[PDB]
Amino acid sequence: MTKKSASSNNKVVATNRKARHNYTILDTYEAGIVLMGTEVKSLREGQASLADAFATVDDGEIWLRNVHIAEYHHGTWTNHAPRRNRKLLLHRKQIDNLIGKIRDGNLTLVPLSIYFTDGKVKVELALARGKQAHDKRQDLARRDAQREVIRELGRRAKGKI
RNA sequence: GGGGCUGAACGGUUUCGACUUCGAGCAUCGAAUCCAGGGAAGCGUGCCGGUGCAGGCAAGAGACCACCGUAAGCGUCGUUGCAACCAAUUAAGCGCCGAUUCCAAUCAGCGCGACUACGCCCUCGCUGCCUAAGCGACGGCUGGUCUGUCAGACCGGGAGUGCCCUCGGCCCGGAUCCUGGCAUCAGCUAGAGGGACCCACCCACGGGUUCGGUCGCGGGACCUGUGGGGACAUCAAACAGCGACUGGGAUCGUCAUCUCGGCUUGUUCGUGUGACCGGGAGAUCCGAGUAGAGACAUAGCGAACUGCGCACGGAGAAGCCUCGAGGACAUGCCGUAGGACCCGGGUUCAAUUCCCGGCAGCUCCACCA
RNA sequence: CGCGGGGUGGAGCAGCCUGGUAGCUCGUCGGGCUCAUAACCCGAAGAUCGUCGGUUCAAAUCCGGCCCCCGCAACCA
C-alpha cells in the first residue's frame, strides 16, 4: 500500500511514534506544511524530531508552532529560524469544521506521518484526545504515569523505530 | 592561499486542495438601497432668519461677531468626553509544607476525693428524705407582729332567682365555715383574682326619604325612647329608596309647543338669509298621556391671494405628487487561477540540474619566498 | 607593521554589499496562580548604534583617523 494501488512513490521518511502513544484513533485529516528549499534536503536522510508540538488557531488559518528541525550535515549552517510560523495549507471546507471542535473539549492537533513525495512533502494531521478524561489530579495520577508509559515504550519497538 | 567531485541532479517533479491578482455574490461595507440644475394652491413666499470648529467626529450655548437694497466661518465662561481600554489558555500537581472545639478539668501517670444556681422564685422554727435539702426553706404537725376568702351597683323586672353586702399596708374584721372530730391554709411577704352589668305597664311622642305621605288600609291602632330616689321622634300590606285607594293639610310637585341658542368649509370675504330654522339628552303658554317606559341634521351661487400696505421673484428646511435603476462608486469574502527548485539571472511551464555564478563547510594543487 | 572580520538595552545574537520610523531570546520592573519560592503567563519601561570628524534633504548604514578585540602573516643566507 504505497499510494492508491500503484500510482506514485511515497514510503520514505518514517512516522513519529509520539502521536500513536499519547493519543487515540478517531479523526484523521491531511494537510501540507509550507516549507522552503533548504528544509527539503534536511528531511531526506531520516532526521526527524520527537519534541512537543501544538497548533494555534488564528482567525481562519492554522499555525502549527513549536517544531524542531535538524538541519545539520558535517559543518555549521546559518539556518533561518527553525521555530518560525509555518502556515499549513488546507481547505476552508475542513478548517471551519475543526475550529469549532478544537475549542470544545480541550483538543489538540498533532501530526501523524510525514509523507515525502517527489521532492514535496505532506503532513498528516489528526484530531484526538489524551488517555485520561480531562484533569482530576487525585483520580488521574496512577494511570497516566504507569499504563501510558508501557504503551509508549512497548509500541515503539514493535514498529521498527 | 586558489580550481571545485557535493548542498532536491534523463526536464514531462500544477499535494483534489492555502494566500494573492481574475470570473461571480454585495450577505457587513461613513445609508429608515439614492435624489433633483422638478411641479401644483386664479404666478410664489415672508412680518424675521443661518453656519461651525482651536481639537480629521459630537453636546450643555451666549440669541459672540457683520451684510453694496441682492444670500458667507466664535472659540465668552463653568462640566467639555472621546486623549477614560485590570487585553485567556492545552493533555506533565501524589515533588516542598499544615493547627481543631460547651457541663468539671487544661503537661502526663498513679494513690485519695470532689464544686456553686437544676428539686430553691420567697425572712425565721420541728420530721421523712430526693445521689446525701450536712436531722431545719416543697409535699405537712405546731409556734407569731405579716389580715388568703361566697365582690360593688346608672336590677328602674313577673317565671326558678333580692345574681351578692369589700378594696392599694385594713376606709373597718374572724364573730355563723379549711386545728382534729368534719368536704379548701407556705399565699413565710409574687398563687396576678375578674371586673361600671343582661330593664314586671304603657307616661307620652312621632306619622317622616318608594308615579310624594299619612288619618279607616294586615297594626287587638302600632313601634320605641322613657317612667317605679327622676324622663321624649315613627311600619315599610309579599317587583325596583323611581311599589298603593274615592276625600281633608304640609313649602304645590313633574312631562312637552314659539322670541333666549349653537354654526358659516384650503387662508381673507363683497352680497344676503336673520334676531330666521333646530319636534337638540334647552326654559316658558295650554292640553294630553299616567308620570321623567322618551328621538331626524342652515346652505348655495363667486370677489381677493401685495398683481389693491412695506419687499423679494429658488428668501433660509409648513406637506404630497412627477423626471431619474446616481455609479455596485464606497469595499474583501467565496468555487480557484497560481506553487519557492540552498538565497540570485536566461528559462520550448517550475531550471545549483542542459547555461551565466555568489557564500559556509569538506576533497584536489606547478616549491624554499 | 600588512590583510580580513567584529563592536547593537544587563549579556549573547538580527539588521551593517540595497543610507526613508533599529527587532528576537534571556534578564529586570509591575500585575496573577501557590501558604510561599521557583517554573508557567502578561503589561510596561530601558540601547540616538565605541568615541571623535566629513559628504547627503536625511548617516547605526557611505568614507577617513584614533583607541580595543579576533583570525591570518610575521618568515630563505
Coordinates of N, CA and C in Angstrom, one line a residue, chain A:
Chain A
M1 N 0.8 -1.2 0.0 CA 0.0 0.0 0.0 C 0.9 1.3 0.0
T2 N 1.3 1.7 -1.2 CA 2.1 2.9 -1.3 C 1.3 4.1 -1.4
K3 N 0.6 4.3 -2.6 CA -0.3 5.4 -2.8 C -1.3 5.0 -3.8
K4 N -2.4 4.5 -3.3 CA -3.6 4.0 -4.1 C -3.1 3.0 -5.2
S5 N -3.1 1.7 -4.8 CA -2.7 0.6 -5.7 C -1.3 0.8 -6.2
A6 N -1.2 1.5 -7.4 CA 0.1 1.8 -8.0 C 0.0 3.0 -8.8
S7 N 0.3 4.2 -8.2 CA 0.2 5.5 -8.9 C 1.4 6.4 -8.6
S8 N 2.0 6.4 -7.4 CA 3.1 7.3 -7.1 C 4.0 6.5 -6.1
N9 N 5.1 7.2 -5.7 CA 6.1 6.7 -4.8 C 6.0 7.5 -3.5
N10 N 5.6 6.9 -2.4 CA 5.5 7.6 -1.1 C 5.7 6.6 0.0
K11 N 6.9 6.4 0.6 CA 7.1 5.5 1.6 C 8.3 5.9 2.5
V12 N 9.1 6.8 1.9 CA 10.3 7.3 2.6 C 9.9 8.1 3.8
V13 N 10.8 8.4 4.7 CA 10.6 9.1 6.0 C 9.6 8.4 6.9
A14 N 10.1 8.0 8.0 CA 9.3 7.2 9.0 C 8.3 8.1 9.7
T15 N 7.4 7.5 10.5 CA 6.3 8.1 11.2 C 6.7 8.3 12.6
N16 N 6.5 9.5 13.1 CA 6.8 9.8 14.6 C 5.8 9.0 15.4
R17 N 6.4 8.2 16.3 CA 5.5 7.3 17.2 C 5.0 8.1 18.4
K18 N 5.3 9.4 18.5 CA 4.8 10.1 19.7 C 3.3 10.3 19.6
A19 N 2.7 10.5 18.4 CA 1.3 10.7 18.3 C 0.5 9.4 18.6
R20 N 1.0 8.3 18.2 CA 0.4 7.0 18.4 C 0.5 6.4 19.8
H21 N 1.1 7.1 20.7 CA 1.3 6.6 22.1 C 0.6 7.4 23.1
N22 N 0.5 8.7 22.9 CA -0.2 9.6 23.9 C -1.6 10.0 23.4
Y23 N -2.0 9.5 22.2 CA -3.3 9.8 21.6 C -4.0 8.6 21.2
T24 N -5.2 8.7 20.6 CA -6.0 7.6 20.2 C -6.4 7.7 18.7
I25 N -7.2 6.8 18.2 CA -7.6 6.8 16.8 C -9.1 7.2 16.7
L26 N -9.3 8.4 16.1 CA -10.6 8.9 15.9 C -10.8 9.6 14.6
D27 N -10.1 10.8 14.5 CA -10.2 11.6 13.3 C -8.8 11.7 12.7
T28 N -8.8 11.8 11.4 CA -7.5 11.8 10.6 C -7.7 12.6 9.4
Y29 N -7.0 13.7 9.3 CA -7.0 14.6 8.1 C -5.7 14.7 7.4
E30 N -5.6 15.4 6.3 CA -4.4 15.6 5.6 C -4.2 17.1 5.3
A31 N -2.9 17.5 5.4 CA -2.5 18.9 5.2 C -1.2 18.9 4.5
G32 N -0.5 20.1 4.6 CA 0.8 20.2 3.9 C 1.5 21.4 4.5
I33 N 2.6 21.2 5.2 CA 3.4 22.3 5.7 C 4.2 23.0 4.6
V34 N 3.9 24.3 4.5 CA 4.6 25.2 3.5 C 6.1 25.3 4.0
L35 N 7.0 24.8 3.3 CA 8.4 24.8 3.6 C 9.2 25.5 2.5
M36 N 10.5 25.8 2.7 CA 11.4 26.4 1.8 C 12.3 25.3 1.1
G37 N 13.2 25.8 0.3 CA 14.1 24.8 -0.4 C 15.2 24.3 0.5
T38 N 15.5 25.0 1.6 CA 16.5 24.5 2.5 C 16.0 23.3 3.3
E39 N 14.8 23.4 3.8 CA 14.2 22.3 4.6 C 13.9 21.0 3.9
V40 N 14.0 21.0 2.5 CA 13.7 19.8 1.7 C 14.9 18.8 1.9
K41 N 16.1 19.3 1.8 CA 17.3 18.4 1.9 C 17.6 18.0 3.4
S42 N 16.9 18.6 4.3 CA 17.1 18.3 5.7 C 16.2 17.2 6.3
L43 N 15.4 16.6 5.5 CA 14.5 15.5 5.9 C 14.5 14.3 5.0
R44 N 15.5 14.2 4.1 CA 15.6 13.1 3.2 C 16.4 11.9 3.8
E45 N 17.3 12.2 4.8 CA 18.1 11.2 5.4 C 17.5 10.7 6.6
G46 N 16.2 11.0 6.9 CA 15.5 10.5 8.1 C 16.0 11.1 9.4
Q47 N 16.0 12.5 9.4 CA 16.4 13.2 10.6 C 15.2 14.0 11.1
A48 N 14.3 13.3 11.8 CA 13.1 13.9 12.4 C 13.4 14.4 13.8
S49 N 12.3 14.6 14.6 CA 12.5 15.0 16.0 C 11.3 14.6 16.8
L50 N 11.5 14.3 18.1 CA 10.5 13.9 19.0 C 10.2 14.9 20.1
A51 N 9.9 16.1 19.7 CA 9.6 17.2 20.6 C 8.1 17.5 20.6
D52 N 7.7 18.4 21.6 CA 6.3 18.7 21.7 C 5.9 19.7 20.5
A53 N 4.6 19.6 20.2 CA 4.0 20.5 19.2 C 2.5 20.7 19.5
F54 N 2.1 22.0 19.1 CA 0.7 22.4 19.3 C 0.3 23.4 18.3
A55 N -0.9 23.3 17.8 CA -1.4 24.2 16.8 C -1.9 25.5 17.5
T56 N -2.2 26.5 16.6 CA -2.6 27.8 17.1 C -3.6 28.4 16.1
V57 N -4.9 28.4 16.5 CA -6.0 28.9 15.7 C -5.9 30.4 15.6
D58 N -5.7 30.9 14.3 CA -5.6 32.4 14.1 C -6.6 32.8 13.0
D59 N -7.7 33.5 13.5 CA -8.7 33.9 12.6 C -9.4 32.8 11.9
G60 N -8.9 32.4 10.7 CA -9.4 31.3 10.0 C -8.3 30.3 9.5
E61 N -7.1 30.7 9.7 CA -6.0 29.8 9.3 C -5.4 29.1 10.5
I62 N -4.6 28.0 10.2 CA -4.0 27.2 11.2 C -2.5 27.4 11.2
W63 N -1.9 27.5 12.4 CA -0.4 27.7 12.5 C 0.2 26.8 13.5
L64 N 0.8 25.7 13.0 CA 1.4 24.7 13.9 C 2.7 25.2 14.4
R65 N 2.8 25.6 15.6 CA 4.0 26.1 16.2 C 4.8 25.0 16.9
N66 N 5.9 25.4 17.5 CA 6.7 24.5 18.3 C 7.1 23.3 17.5
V67 N 8.1 23.4 16.7 CA 8.7 22.3 15.9 C 10.2 22.3 15.9
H68 N 10.8 21.2 15.9 CA 12.3 21.1 15.9 C 12.7 20.4 14.6
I69 N 13.7 21.1 13.9 CA 14.2 20.5 12.6 C 15.7 20.4 12.8
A70 N 16.3 19.3 12.3 CA 17.7 19.0 12.4 C 18.6 20.0 11.7
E71 N 18.6 19.9 10.4 CA 19.5 20.8 9.6 C 20.9 20.8 10.0
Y72 N 21.6 19.7 9.8 CA 23.0 19.5 10.2 C 23.6 18.4 9.5
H73 N 24.6 18.6 8.7 CA 25.3 17.6 8.0 C 26.7 17.4 8.6
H74 N 27.8 18.1 8.0 CA 29.1 18.0 8.6 C 29.6 19.2 9.3
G75 N 29.4 20.4 8.7 CA 29.8 21.7 9.2 C 28.7 22.5 9.7
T76 N 29.0 23.7 10.1 CA 28.0 24.7 10.6 C 27.1 25.2 9.5
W77 N 25.8 25.5 9.9 CA 24.9 26.0 8.9 C 24.2 27.3 9.5
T78 N 24.0 28.3 8.7 CA 23.4 29.5 9.1 C 22.0 29.4 9.5
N79 N 21.3 28.5 8.9 CA 19.8 28.2 9.2 C 19.0 29.5 8.9
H80 N 17.7 29.4 9.4 CA 16.8 30.5 9.2 C 15.6 30.4 10.1
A81 N 15.8 30.5 11.4 CA 14.7 30.4 12.4 C 14.0 29.1 12.3
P82 N 14.5 28.1 13.0 CA 13.9 26.8 12.9 C 12.5 26.7 13.6
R83 N 12.2 27.6 14.5 CA 11.0 27.7 15.2 C 10.2 28.9 14.8
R84 N 9.8 29.0 13.5 CA 9.1 30.1 12.9 C 7.6 29.7 12.8
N85 N 6.8 30.6 12.1 CA 5.4 30.3 11.9 C 5.3 29.8 10.5
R86 N 4.9 28.5 10.4 CA 4.7 27.8 9.1 C 3.3 27.6 8.8
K87 N 2.6 28.4 8.1 CA 1.2 28.3 7.7 C 0.9 27.0 7.0
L88 N -0.1 26.2 7.5 CA -0.4 24.9 6.9 C -1.6 25.1 6.0
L89 N -1.3 24.7 4.7 CA -2.4 24.8 3.7 C -3.5 23.7 3.9
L90 N -4.7 24.1 3.6 CA -5.9 23.2 3.8 C -7.0 23.7 2.9
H91 N -8.2 23.4 3.4 CA -9.5 23.8 2.7 C -10.5 24.4 3.6
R92 N -10.9 25.6 3.4 CA -11.9 26.3 4.2 C -13.1 25.4 4.6
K93 N -13.2 24.3 3.7 CA -14.3 23.4 4.0 C -14.0 22.4 5.1
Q94 N -12.7 22.3 5.5 CA -12.3 21.5 6.6 C -11.9 22.3 7.8
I95 N -11.3 23.5 7.6 CA -10.8 24.3 8.6 C -12.0 24.7 9.5
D96 N -13.1 25.3 8.9 CA -14.3 25.7 9.7 C -14.8 24.5 10.5
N97 N -14.6 23.3 10.0 CA -15.1 22.1 10.8 C -14.1 21.6 11.8
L98 N -13.0 22.4 12.1 CA -12.0 22.0 13.1 C -11.9 23.0 14.2
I99 N -12.1 24.3 13.9 CA -12.0 25.3 14.9 C -13.1 25.1 16.0
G100 N -14.3 24.8 15.6 CA -15.4 24.6 16.5 C -15.3 23.4 17.3
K101 N -14.5 22.4 16.9 CA -14.2 21.2 17.7 C -13.0 21.2 18.5
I102 N -12.0 22.0 18.1 CA -10.7 22.0 18.9 C -10.9 22.9 20.1
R103 N -11.9 23.8 20.1 CA -12.2 24.7 21.2 C -13.4 24.3 22.0
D104 N -13.6 23.0 22.2 CA -14.7 22.5 22.9 C -14.3 21.7 24.1
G105 N -13.9 20.4 23.9 CA -13.5 19.5 25.0 C -12.0 19.5 25.2
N106 N -11.3 20.6 24.9 CA -9.9 20.8 25.1 C -9.2 19.8 24.2
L107 N -9.1 20.0 22.9 CA -8.5 19.1 22.0 C -7.2 19.7 21.4
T108 N -6.3 18.9 20.9 CA -5.1 19.3 20.3 C -5.0 19.0 18.8
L109 N -3.9 19.1 18.2 CA -3.7 18.9 16.8 C -2.2 18.5 16.6
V110 N -1.9 17.2 16.6 CA -0.6 16.7 16.4 C -0.5 16.0 15.1
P111 N 0.7 16.0 14.4 CA 0.8 15.3 13.1 C 1.0 13.8 13.3
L112 N 0.8 13.1 12.2 CA 0.9 11.7 12.2 C 2.1 11.3 11.3
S113 N 1.9 10.9 10.1 CA 3.0 10.5 9.2 C 3.5 11.7 8.4
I114 N 4.8 11.7 8.0 CA 5.3 12.7 7.2 C 5.6 12.2 5.8
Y115 N 4.6 12.3 4.9 CA 4.7 11.8 3.5 C 5.6 12.7 2.7
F116 N 6.7 12.2 2.3 CA 7.7 12.9 1.4 C 7.5 12.4 0.0
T117 N 6.8 13.1 -0.8 CA 6.6 12.7 -2.2 C 7.8 13.1 -3.1
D118 N 7.6 13.3 -4.4 CA 8.6 13.7 -5.3 C 9.1 15.1 -5.0
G119 N 10.0 15.2 -4.0 CA 10.6 16.5 -3.7 C 9.7 17.2 -2.6
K120 N 8.4 17.3 -2.9 CA 7.5 17.9 -2.0 C 7.2 17.1 -0.7
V121 N 6.4 17.6 0.2 CA 6.1 16.9 1.4 C 4.6 17.0 1.7
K122 N 4.1 16.2 2.7 CA 2.7 16.2 3.0 C 2.5 15.7 4.5
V123 N 2.1 16.6 5.3 CA 1.9 16.3 6.7 C 0.5 15.7 6.9
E124 N 0.3 14.9 7.9 CA -0.9 14.2 8.2 C -1.4 14.6 9.6
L125 N -2.4 15.4 9.7 CA -2.9 15.8 10.9 C -4.0 14.9 11.5
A126 N -4.3 15.1 12.8 CA -5.3 14.2 13.4 C -5.9 15.0 14.6
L127 N -7.2 14.7 14.9 CA -7.9 15.3 16.0 C -8.2 14.2 17.0
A128 N -7.4 14.1 18.0 CA -7.6 13.0 19.0 C -7.6 13.6 20.4
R129 N -7.5 12.8 21.4 CA -7.5 13.2 22.8 C -6.7 12.3 23.7
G130 N -6.3 12.8 24.8 CA -5.4 12.0 25.7 C -6.1 10.8 26.3
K131 N -5.3 9.9 26.9 CA -5.8 8.7 27.5 C -6.7 9.0 28.7
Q132 N -6.5 10.1 29.4 CA -7.2 10.5 30.6 C -8.4 11.4 30.2
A133 N -9.4 11.4 31.1 CA -10.6 12.2 30.9 C -10.4 13.5 31.7
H134 N -10.1 14.6 30.9 CA -9.9 15.9 31.4 C -8.7 15.9 32.5
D135 N -8.9 16.5 33.6 CA -7.9 16.5 34.7 C -8.6 16.3 36.0
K136 N -8.2 15.3 36.8 CA -8.7 15.1 38.1 C -7.7 15.0 39.2
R137 N -6.4 15.1 38.9 CA -5.3 15.2 39.9 C -5.3 13.9 40.7
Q138 N -6.2 13.8 41.7 CA -6.3 12.7 42.6 C -6.7 11.4 41.8
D139 N -7.7 11.5 41.0 CA -8.2 10.4 40.2 C -7.4 10.1 38.9
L140 N -6.5 11.0 38.5 CA -5.7 10.9 37.3 C -4.3 11.1 37.7
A141 N -3.6 10.1 38.2 CA -2.2 10.2 38.6 C -1.5 8.9 38.5
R142 N -2.2 7.8 38.7 CA -1.7 6.4 38.7 C -1.8 5.7 37.3
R143 N -2.7 6.3 36.4 CA -2.9 5.7 35.1 C -2.2 6.4 34.0
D144 N -1.8 7.7 34.2 CA -1.1 8.4 33.2 C 0.4 8.3 33.3
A145 N 0.9 7.8 34.4 CA 2.3 7.7 34.6 C 2.8 6.2 34.7
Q146 N 1.9 5.3 34.5 CA 2.2 3.9 34.6 C 1.8 3.1 33.4
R147 N 0.4 3.1 33.1 CA -0.1 2.4 32.0 C 0.2 3.2 30.7
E148 N 0.4 4.5 30.7 CA 0.7 5.2 29.5 C 2.2 5.0 29.1
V149 N 3.0 4.8 30.1 CA 4.5 4.6 29.8 C 4.7 3.3 29.1
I150 N 3.9 2.3 29.4 CA 4.0 1.0 28.8 C 3.6 1.0 27.3
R151 N 2.5 1.8 27.0 CA 2.1 1.9 25.7 C 3.0 2.7 24.8
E152 N 3.9 3.6 25.5 CA 4.8 4.4 24.8 C 6.1 3.7 24.5
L153 N 6.6 2.8 25.4 CA 7.8 2.1 25.3 C 7.6 0.7 24.7
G154 N 6.4 0.3 24.5 CA 6.1 -1.1 24.0 C 5.8 -1.1 22.5
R155 N 4.9 -0.1 22.1 CA 4.6 0.0 20.7 C 5.6 0.6 19.8
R156 N 6.7 1.3 20.4 CA 7.7 1.8 19.6 C 8.7 0.8 19.1
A157 N 9.0 -0.2 19.9 CA 9.9 -1.3 19.5 C 9.2 -2.3 18.5
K158 N 7.9 -2.3 18.5 CA 7.2 -3.2 17.6 C 7.2 -2.7 16.1
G159 N 7.0 -1.4 15.9 CA 7.1 -0.8 14.6 C 8.4 -0.3 14.2
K160 N 9.4 -1.1 14.2 CA 10.8 -0.7 13.9 C 11.3 0.4 14.8
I161 N 11.2 1.7 14.3 CA 11.6 2.8 15.1 C 10.6 3.2 16.1

